[PDB]
Design an enzyme around this catalytic site. Structure first.
Site, PDB file in Angstrom:
ATOM      1  N   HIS A   1      29.759  12.187 108.526  1.00 66.13           N
ATOM      2  CA  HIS A   1      31.207  12.069 108.406  1.00 66.13           C
ATOM      3  C   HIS A   1      31.692  13.151 107.450  1.00 66.13           C
ATOM      4  O   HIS A   1      31.474  13.060 106.238  1.00 66.13           O
ATOM      5  CB  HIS A   1      31.593  10.678 107.908  1.00 66.13           C
ATOM      6  CG  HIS A   1      33.010  10.293 108.202  1.00 66.13           C
ATOM      7  ND1 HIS A   1      34.084  11.099 107.895  1.00 66.13           N
ATOM      8  CD2 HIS A   1      33.528   9.179 108.768  1.00 66.13           C
ATOM      9  CE1 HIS A   1      35.202  10.501 108.263  1.00 66.13           C
ATOM     10  NE2 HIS A   1      34.892   9.334 108.796  1.00 66.13           N
TER      11      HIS A   1
ATOM     12  N   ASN B   1      36.976  16.243 130.346  1.00 62.64           N
ATOM     13  CA  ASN B   1      36.686  15.819 128.978  1.00 62.64           C
ATOM     14  C   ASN B   1      37.011  14.335 128.843  1.00 62.64           C
ATOM     15  O   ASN B   1      38.019  13.931 128.262  1.00 62.64           O
ATOM     16  CB  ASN B   1      37.463  16.664 127.977  1.00 62.64           C
ATOM     17  CG  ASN B   1      37.096  16.355 126.535  1.00 62.64           C
ATOM     18  OD1 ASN B   1      36.063  15.751 126.257  1.00 62.64           O
ATOM     19  ND2 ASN B   1      37.950  16.772 125.610  1.00 62.64           N
TER      20      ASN B   1
ATOM     21  N   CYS C   1      36.608  10.773 119.557  1.00 65.38           N
ATOM     22  CA  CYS C   1      35.718  11.078 120.671  1.00 65.38           C
ATOM     23  C   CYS C   1      34.245  10.925 120.327  1.00 65.38           C
ATOM     24  O   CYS C   1      33.398  11.198 121.182  1.00 65.38           O
ATOM     25  CB  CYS C   1      35.971  12.503 121.169  1.00 65.38           C
ATOM     26  SG  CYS C   1      37.678  12.842 121.645  1.00 65.38           S
TER      27      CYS C   1
ATOM     28  N   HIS D   1      32.823  20.407 134.350  1.00 64.79           N
ATOM     29  CA  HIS D   1      33.373  20.957 135.583  1.00 64.79           C
ATOM     30  C   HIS D   1      33.766  19.857 136.559  1.00 64.79           C
ATOM     31  O   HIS D   1      34.797  19.959 137.232  1.00 64.79           O
ATOM     32  CB  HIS D   1      32.364  21.907 136.224  1.00 64.79           C
ATOM     33  CG  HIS D   1      32.872  22.589 137.454  1.00 64.79           C
ATOM     34  ND1 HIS D   1      32.791  22.022 138.708  1.00 64.79           N
ATOM     35  CD2 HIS D   1      33.465  23.793 137.624  1.00 64.79           C
ATOM     36  CE1 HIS D   1      33.316  22.846 139.596  1.00 64.79           C
ATOM     37  NE2 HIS D   1      33.732  23.928 138.965  1.00 64.79           N
TER      38      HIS D   1
ATOM     39  N   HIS E   1      28.273  17.109 124.006  1.00 64.53           N
ATOM     40  CA  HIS E   1      29.524  16.511 124.458  1.00 64.53           C
ATOM     41  C   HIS E   1      30.465  17.578 125.000  1.00 64.53           C
ATOM     42  O   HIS E   1      30.683  18.612 124.364  1.00 64.53           O
ATOM     43  CB  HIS E   1      30.184  15.756 123.307  1.00 64.53           C
ATOM     44  CG  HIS E   1      31.623  15.428 123.534  1.00 64.53           C
ATOM     45  ND1 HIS E   1      32.034  14.448 124.409  1.00 64.53           N
ATOM     46  CD2 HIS E   1      32.750  15.938 122.984  1.00 64.53           C
ATOM     47  CE1 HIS E   1      33.353  14.375 124.398  1.00 64.53           C
ATOM     48  NE2 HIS E   1      33.812  15.268 123.539  1.00 64.53           N
TER      49      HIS E   1
ATOM     50  N   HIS F   1      15.702  17.742 126.918  1.00 66.54           N
ATOM     51  CA  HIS F   1      16.987  17.525 127.569  1.00 66.54           C
ATOM     52  C   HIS F   1      18.084  17.529 126.518  1.00 66.54           C
ATOM     53  O   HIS F   1      17.948  16.879 125.479  1.00 66.54           O
ATOM     54  CB  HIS F   1      17.003  16.200 128.336  1.00 66.54           C
ATOM     55  CG  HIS F   1      16.057  16.164 129.494  1.00 66.54           C
ATOM     56  ND1 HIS F   1      15.933  17.209 130.382  1.00 66.54           N
ATOM     57  CD2 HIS F   1      15.188  15.213 129.907  1.00 66.54           C
ATOM     58  CE1 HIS F   1      15.029  16.902 131.295  1.00 66.54           C
ATOM     59  NE2 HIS F   1      14.562  15.696 131.030  1.00 66.54           N
TER      60      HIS F   1
END
Lengths: 411, 427, 427, 411
Positions: free
Chosen positions: B234, B355, B155, B351, B322, B318
């Site tokens: 990582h 996801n 992701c 909402h 995720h 801003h």
């Protein structure tokens, strides 16, 4: 030649309704144990995939969001004995059962076997999971010759039968690309008191049930749907000479014919229930139960040895109206087939207006489910508008003896 | 001086890196004929399985997951038994991608003979003719193109493709790069009943975003953002963080993602080791003086002061966290002490859309663009975290103030948002 | 001059690219306890199936393909019903990769903390924690590493990773880049009986290669090859070349690669359109003067002359055509006029190791290094062709003559090769 | 409690043999219809996985490469009525069949049930796919209690019984970390034309078979393997009093006892077929059939009324040798159980030398397949080197009458 390959899917409304509760009326809970089964036969299923038939249901269920709801139960703040149900309008969906059959459709229509509606409508009910049972199943079966039979199994809790046929016509008009007539749901259904605990003699008060809204009838019943032609309707009016009366000679004649044929078999059907689907008593709402339940006494000779004109003059003038006491009752009711042989008057309903694109349907029959141990007679109209289609739900033992007795009257 | 001037003015203009602009991007808005409500999901999973321990877990997951009533699933999980084929999943990849690039080539005027680099990331679905070859075949691109297809990176491969298209635009001058971040949900379904592989069923929804980057100088009077930093971390060297998100097969032979029980103690260490290495890059100099002005009073005065996390609200305007779950955004709100307004896109994207795996950051950016909150000179922070424990981050910088009708994925329901989301969706 | 030498001597040395070397490379020599002979394969595929049309096709494929008796299959295709699991295919990926990197880190002295870029390509198998994350977890690499995982790019992804680690070594100075090309045969096995999808059953064998590049100047006397050109060619815009090699599903639901019946007319087009674009780069100017100088004598004299392809023997010394099959090295020898010593590594690599998908070029390079034919100053040409019909090519240049014992995969059987390959293996 | 979960796999030689054609002898084709099944029971299967049992089979089959070959057929340039087979040494493989059982192994050893070797050895033959039939099957059965039962299904074409047991010990010595002896395949086999059409009266010439090297028996066969202890082996030596003959009383007494017990059941088995697996007549070669096929006539009284001592004296000197004419025959031979009751002398063979790590086996039994309609008696050695294990392969109707008659001697 059986129906195989069932694929199940759902269609939800296109707009989020939210935290809305649809309140069921006091007449919607008397007809909660019955179910409707409707098959709409089409000739050519060309151009009708299972996407162009599912896509107009997303703007169709936006007007009819209680049909996509689920049954729930309110809370008891006082005495814990009554729990009035309500349709919580969570957009759960409407089942779409894609199927296919390898038999020729035009041979299966003119086949006269007991049970054809049972396999083309999805055989289900507000069953053991009452909070997760859908209120409508649509079975779209494709035939080998290119036929199409839409099987609508409409729960009798949420709507009527003339409130179901127009609810399907408002999907067929969206599919055709027209503008449907706007639905009316804005007057909320309020419960009324009146303390009437007496059971009316047109219904049979079954025991209290909680999580399975279906009375097992005991006898295995089947839907035998024969036809009443035009030349026999004029052959039924030849006994109505020499006397003038208010008997409408297109429902109370053929229903008296089936009453005589069932009285010839059974012991004594002394009283019968007449459930008129009258159009004058209808309000503006699109999901409401405005039927006219009644009962007709014999008050004289037995219906087995009587002419049809006497059982026609008896069925019209001497009906006693009881649709207020059925809606004012507190327990479970079981109108259709419970106490007596019911005689439905679903003949002014426009069944053949399900024009999908420009295609008038070939043959339309309405069977039922949840009928009690007496039977039901559903006098439907034909495609030309001059004949009648009589679907008789019967316990199967009385089906093969009905076709013998009715053979001398239909020729 | 007059002659020792071009010796500085020709090295400072040749050793500086090329700027990488963000011209425009388009996000896929799935139709209303694909939505899955709460009761539809809890009727499908109640009719599939028989044990009531595999539905009372998914009820407790979905009623507190934070998702809404407009989240969409592909048209193969709308059957009561879902049937994941390869034609049924390739026909979804031709829908969420070919309608997100058709939206991009109509708002920038992108002639398809001008795309020089093409990076397409997708975690699970990867055919033998890849998705980049499908995009080349559909739009008839050039034969000397630089097409890459990252697959299996989780992701957080949305900000790996941005780093790849950034590092390929420094080598090749005057080029455009098409970046497509997607997730195909049709081969992502889990048929089994193991209670730790059911969480990717209840969260992952449809969505894809096509991104056009360019390093030209002509795309400065037309571009919206400028890529400032990309930081990758990582955490796969630790054996706890490598086998946390894991793809296995259960005892019946069904594949799926096996999330570990300690994912919140692992995501909380990959986020704090990415914030730490991005701190000296983005924090102002008045806030980077806890190292040589306050930590000099930590080693001899008292081992352990009052805990002072540096506030990033002076560095950024801003935030685009995720939308993994509701529990990872409440955790990142307590740490950085973000306002309830700073976390609004990361909540309303979860909402509204759910996801979406690799492309939730672009819906979170389209939320801030569609409300009219993206002024000129603002700095955007996009944080993402994946499966080998990667937590990549990227900082943009807005160039021109975007007007409020944007023709994005939000412009039919942006008069309704923000909505009050409850803790427990009632069943 | 004496003062206008910093301006010409500065803008030239900041415009030249950083040189990319090949320090060393290690290949996987599979053990003798995994070989599949001809008769063992034709007994296994006769016990699996029942029809005679599907076995008489595999006999005709395998007895004319040109493979030998030492080609190896993974230890899950050695059962009579092959049972490809996720764990059984991942445990082969830990065998072919970790025993090829361990060979590389003991012949170069490479510390694992020195690897800055890691590019792993594998066509079919790609888990949710990718193979690059598996290499990171095994060797405990750095947390700020640039790890990319290309997947689904076919058999020509061995030279896409080389181009990627070339373009990532221009941006980041003084870095080492590890490139791993592999193919996992265990999830590649086709279970069905379609007569155009059984061709990847009879050709693909075990093999993997780890490649170490760098752009330092300390590793310019220890290195072996210097990469000169990489020329990519993607014919996926053609509608018949995109669906040439195609991953489908049959009527029973077994996924597999479906090769078209017109492949040798498409593979002969991507080769002639990559040779055309690499021709003016590597051909000498004395031989390039029959295209700027002979084509004048066509449009005004006679359209239609004797066929003069430019001879690439005067441009290279060693050819490394990818060992796809026997029916592609003969057609690339026939019209390009190569001596039998030129196409000898490509034949004996196919005869000994079989069609290893991405890493056949490194076995073909180890053949030329093992015979002692790689002198100092020779140019090596490596051709590849893949699944969407990417047809990539790379031209190396040897920096120091490699001594004859090389400790590669060939040194245990190099005293027998070249052996004569029969036209039909008689059974 | 039956075996289940057969996972089949093959093992090949580690080095490529090339194009070598192993030529079979003239005695290698007389024994082509028979098969050897031998089970090696191990008590503790700890550390013996099915990878450490398969890894020494790659160097072991490099020494014994005709075992991993396949049967082929040469062409006849002259008259095409015979086509002499040969073993083409393509490295095709040896089957490894991992199975598992859920019974107690030490209870199944002392079970005395008719038929146990058929379940632990893979029952196949050089069957209708003759060019693709393996010459050796190895079945590794993991028991519930931790036992291990290696079942070797060996084809009698390629090797003998003492050429099978030492060939298996040469695998156990590679597995055990030792160094095996050198194998000898160096002198090739050549046919010698002797033009002998007389069928020997110790064998039964079965009809011409072409693609299924197995004679299907009329009666159903089963292997009942009892045990002959030391306290009976000294009991049988006490009727040799008053006479000192060459009755070697550990094969010629035991097998004469079994001959008398079978002649008690059946009508009159006057002649037998003694197939001695002698060790002094073995040549240097590692895969060859140096058996000693003969026949012993009764020549007088029936063997049902004659004592065991006289039937031992008859079986030691009156062996009329016929192993030279059996090999020089041209048709199909069917030695074991074809003409008469077969008595095998597998007692000097090192059965218990299969020490895989240091584990001497607890129970080793050798059965056969393809035995004809007369019977085979295999006198094997015991674990402690003092008793005799007798595997009797008879028709299933003659086993239940054999255990009752043989109880009067063993006790």
């Amino acid at each position: 030649g059986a129906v195989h390959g069932h694929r199940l899917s759902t269609v939800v409304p296109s707009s989020v309704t939210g935290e809305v509760d649809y309140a069921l009326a006091d007449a919607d809970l008397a007809f909660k144990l019955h179910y409707l089964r409707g098959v709409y036969y089409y000739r050519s299923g060309d151009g009708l995939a299972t996407k162009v038939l599912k896509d107009p249901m997303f703007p169709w269920l936006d007007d009819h969001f209680p049909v996509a709801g689920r049954v729930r139960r309110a809370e008891a703040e006082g005495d814990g004995a009554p729990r009035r149900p309500y349709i919580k309008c969570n957009d759960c969906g409407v089942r779409i059962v894609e199927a296919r059959c390898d038999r020729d459709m035009a041979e299966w229509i003119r086949d006269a076997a007991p049970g054809r509606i049972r396999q083309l409508c999805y055989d289900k009910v507000l069953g053991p999971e009452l909070f997760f049972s859908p209120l409508l199943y649509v079975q779209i079966t494709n035939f080998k010759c290119g036929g199409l039979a839409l099987g609508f199994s409409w729960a009798h809790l949420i709507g009527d039968i003339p409130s179901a046929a127009t609810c399907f016509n408002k999907w067929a008009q969206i599919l055709s690309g027209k503008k449907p007539e706007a639905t009316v749901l804005t007057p909320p259904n309020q419960p009324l008191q009146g303390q009437s605990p007496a059971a009316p003699r047109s219904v049979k008060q079954v025991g209290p049930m909680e999580d399975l809204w279906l009375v097992p009838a005991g006898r295995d019943m089947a839907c035998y749907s024969f036809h009443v032609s035009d030349a026999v309707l004029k052959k039924l009016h030849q006994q109505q000479n020499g006397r003038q009366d208010a008997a409408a000679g297109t429902f109370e004649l053929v229903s008296a014919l089936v009453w005589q044929a069932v009285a010839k078999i059974r012991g004594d059907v002394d009283t019968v229930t007449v459930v008129r689907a009258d159009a004058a008593a209808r309000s503006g709402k699109s999901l409401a139960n405005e039927m006219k339940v009644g009962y007709v006494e014999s008050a004289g000779s037995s219906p087995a040895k009587t002419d049809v004109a006497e059982l026609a003059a008896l069925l019209a003038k001497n009906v006693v109206d009881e649709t207020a006491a059925v809606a004012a009752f507190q327990g479970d009711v079981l109108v259709y087939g419970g106490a007596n042989l019911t005689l439905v008057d679903m003949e002014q309903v426009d069944l053949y207006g399900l024009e999908i694109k420009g295609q008038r349907p070939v043959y339309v029959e309405y069977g039922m489910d949840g009928v009690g141990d007496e039977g039901a007679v559903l006098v439907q109209p034909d495609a030309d508008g001059r004949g009648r289609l009589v679907t008789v739900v019967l316990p199967g033992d009385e089906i093969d003896s009905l076709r013998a007795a009715l053979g001398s009257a239909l020729h | 001086s007059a002659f020792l001037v071009v010796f500085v003015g020709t090295v400072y203009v040749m050793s500086r890196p090329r700027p990488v602009y963000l011209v425009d991007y388009a996000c896929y808005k799935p139709p209303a004929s694909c939505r899955v409500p709460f009761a539809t999901f809890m009727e499908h999973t109640r009719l599939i399985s028989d044990d009531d321990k595999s539905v009372r877990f998914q009820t407790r997951i979905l009623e507190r997951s934070g998702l809404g009533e407009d989240t969409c699933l592909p048209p193969a999980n709308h059957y009561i038994p879902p049937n994941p084929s390869m034609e049924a999943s390739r026909a979804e990849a031709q829908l969420v991608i070919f309608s997100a690039i058709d939206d991009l080539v109509r708002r920038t005027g992108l002639k398809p003979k001008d795309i020089d680099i093409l990076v397409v990331n997708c975690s699970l679905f990867s055919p033998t003719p890849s998705l980049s070859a499908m995009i080349i075949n559909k739009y008839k691109l050039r034969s000397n193109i630089r097409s890459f297809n990252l697959s299996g990176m989780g992701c957080s491969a949305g900000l790996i493709s941005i780093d790849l298209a950034r590092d390929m635009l420094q080598v090749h001058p005057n080029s455009n790069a098409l970046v497509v971040s997607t997730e195909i949900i049709t081969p992502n379904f889990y048929q089994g009943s193991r209670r730790d592989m059911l969480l990717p069923n209840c969260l992952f929804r449809m969505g894809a975003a096509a991104i056009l980057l360019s390093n030209r100088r002509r795309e400065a009077r037309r571009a919206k953002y400028r890529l400032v930093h990309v930081v990758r971390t990582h955490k796969g060297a630790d054996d706890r963080a490598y086998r946390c998100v894991y793809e296995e097969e259960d005892e019946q032979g069904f594949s799926g993602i096996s999330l570990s029980k300690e994912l919140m103690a692992i995501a909380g260490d990959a986020l704090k080791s990415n914030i730490t290495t991005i701190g000296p890059l983005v924090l102002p100099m008045s806030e980077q003086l806890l190292f040589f002005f306050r930590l000099v009073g930590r080693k001899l005065v008292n081992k352990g002061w009052r805990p002072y996390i540096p506030d990033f609200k002076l560095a950024f305007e801003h935030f685009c966290i995720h939308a993994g779950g509701r529990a990872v955004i409440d955790e990142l709100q307590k740490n950085l002490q973000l306002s309830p307004r700073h976390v609004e896109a990361s909540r309303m994207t979860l909402h509204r859309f759910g996801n979406t795996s690799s492309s939730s950051l672009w819906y979170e950016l389209a939320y801030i663009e569609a409300k009219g909150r993206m002024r000129r000179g603002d700095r955007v922070w996009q944080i993402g975290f994946g499966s080998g424990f990667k937590c990549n981050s990227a900082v943009w910088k807005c160039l021109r103030s975007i007007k409020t009708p944007t023709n994005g994925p939000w412009d039919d329901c942006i008069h309704r948002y923000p909505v009050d989301v409850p803790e427990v969706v009632k069943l």
